[PDB]
Enzyme design. Structure first.
Site, PDB file in Angstrom:
ATOM      1  N   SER A 119       5.621  -0.201  -1.686  1.00  0.00           N
ATOM      2  CA  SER A 119       4.047   0.812  -2.103  1.00  0.00           C
ATOM      3  C   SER A 119       4.345   1.262  -0.431  1.00  0.00           C
ATOM      4  O   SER A 119       5.054   2.259  -0.819  1.00  0.00           O
ATOM      5  CB  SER A 119       2.887  -0.518  -2.254  1.00  0.00           C
ATOM      6  OG  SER A 119       2.131   0.755  -2.697  1.00  0.00           O
ATOM      7  N   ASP A 174       1.204  -1.319 -13.160  1.00  0.00           N
ATOM      8  CA  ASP A 174       1.040  -1.294 -11.835  1.00  0.00           C
ATOM      9  C   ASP A 174      -0.526  -0.700 -11.875  1.00  0.00           C
ATOM     10  O   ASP A 174      -0.727  -0.133 -12.564  1.00  0.00           O
ATOM     11  CB  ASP A 174       2.108  -0.576 -10.769  1.00  0.00           C
ATOM     12  CG  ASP A 174       1.628  -0.959  -9.190  1.00  0.00           C
ATOM     13  OD1 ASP A 174       0.407  -0.773  -9.254  1.00  0.00           O
ATOM     14  OD2 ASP A 174       2.566  -0.668  -8.555  1.00  0.00           O
ATOM     15  N   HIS A 208       2.124  -4.427  -9.869  1.00  0.00           N
ATOM     16  CA  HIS A 208       1.730  -4.010  -8.242  1.00  0.00           C
ATOM     17  C   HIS A 208       4.032  -4.862  -7.631  1.00  0.00           C
ATOM     18  O   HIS A 208       2.221  -6.203  -6.794  1.00  0.00           O
ATOM     19  CB  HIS A 208       0.983  -3.691  -7.838  1.00  0.00           C
ATOM     20  CG  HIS A 208       1.226  -3.153  -6.614  1.00  0.00           C
ATOM     21  ND1 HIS A 208       2.022  -2.030  -6.306  1.00  0.00           N
ATOM     22  CD2 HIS A 208       1.410  -3.701  -5.025  1.00  0.00           C
ATOM     23  CE1 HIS A 208       2.199  -1.249  -5.694  1.00  0.00           C
ATOM     24  NE2 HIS A 208       1.279  -2.362  -4.843  1.00  0.00           N
TER      25      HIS A 208
END
Ligand SMILES: [Br-]
Ligand SMILES: [Br-]
Ligand SMILES: [Br-]
Ligand SMILES: [Br-]
Ligand SMILES: [Br-]
Ligand SMILES: [Br-]
Ligand SMILES: [Br-]
Ligand SMILES: [Br-]
Ligand SMILES: [Br-]
Ligand SMILES: [Br-]
Ligand SMILES: [Br-]
Ligand SMILES: [Br-]
Ligand SMILES: [Br-]
Ligand SMILES: [Br-]
Ligand SMILES: [Br-]
Ligand SMILES: [Br-]
Ligand SMILES: [Br-]
Ligand SMILES: [Br-]
Ligand SMILES: [Br-]
Length: 229
Positions: A119, A174, A208
């Site tokens: 991320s 996600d 995620h």
């Protein structure tokens, strides 16, 4: 590595069992931690690679209602339109270059170092590798995006990492960083760098996070680019 960036502890580290002839510097995202990633990388560790998971300075994060937490740079939103923390991204990139340099001064050449992250840490690994003249072995960019995308060339970037290998990974479920971000990023990376060495993998049901099959693809990528001797 500058003042805010030496407020943290030393990195979480998975040592090499043999003597380390290569390194992986892996940058966490908002919420997840250096420690958590070091435990994940222990599961795929190579006898001659050291895995370095640095900690990010603790600072309010706009996305999280200004709660203070470890953060490489601020995040304002995660739509394609969102305003980005340009100065914080550049500052963080200079600290990551400093961290690579510390490995180079300890005897491991930058072309035996993979930079990667999750991320905003993956975003930072891409930004850093595409803007440094330290030649790196490869980048593993997991569930992320290319920061300040409009600041990049519309064609090749040139310079030391023009032929760098990149594995970009994304979950199809996600809810924070949309799969579209991964896709648009791989597209942009295939024009920035030699597209022969850019690979995109997606994972069904992964949100995620990472997942076991993703960690096996990351292991195969790292190991092939950083072989013994
Ligand atoms: Br420490
Ligand atoms: Br080591
Ligand atoms: Br060493
Ligand atoms: Br974690
Ligand atoms: Br550090
Ligand atoms: Br941390
Ligand atoms: Br934009
Ligand atoms: Br993030
Ligand atoms: Br920009
Ligand atoms: Br090549
Ligand atoms: Br879901
Ligand atoms: Br979801
Ligand atoms: Br490759
Ligand atoms: Br691909
Ligand atoms: Br995970
Ligand atoms: Br899996
Ligand atoms: Br691959
Ligand atoms: Br070796
Ligand atoms: Br081997």
């Amino acid at each position: 590595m500058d003042p805010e960036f030496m407020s943290t502890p030393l990195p979480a580290i998975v040592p090499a069992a043999r003597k380390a002839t290569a390194a992986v510097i892996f940058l966490h995202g908002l919420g997840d931690t250096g420690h958590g990633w070091a435990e994940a990388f222990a599961g795929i560790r190579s006898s001659h690679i050291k895995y370095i998971c640095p900690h990010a300075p603790v600072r309010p994060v706009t996305l999280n209602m200004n709660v203070a937490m470890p953060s490489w740079f601020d995040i304002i939103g995660l739509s394609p339109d969102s305003q980005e923390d340009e100065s914080g991204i550049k500052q963080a990139a200079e600290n990551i270059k400093a961290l690579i340099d510390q490995e180079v001064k300890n005897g491991i050449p930058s072309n035996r170092i993979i930079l990667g992250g999750f991320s905003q840490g993956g975003a930072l690994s891409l930004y850093t590798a595409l803007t440094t003249q330290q030649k790196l072995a490869g980048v593993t960019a997991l569930s992320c995006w290319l920061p300040l995308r409009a600041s990049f060339p519309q064609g090749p970037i040139g310079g030391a990492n023009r032929d760098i290998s990149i594995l970009q990974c994304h979950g199809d479920c996600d809810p924070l960083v949309p799969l579209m971000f991964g896709s648009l990023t791989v597209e942009k990376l295939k024009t920035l760098v030699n597209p022969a060495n850019v690979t995109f993998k997606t994972y069904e049901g992964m949100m995620h996070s990472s997942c076991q099959q993703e960690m096996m693809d990351v292991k195969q990528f790292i190991d092939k680019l950083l072989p013994p001797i």
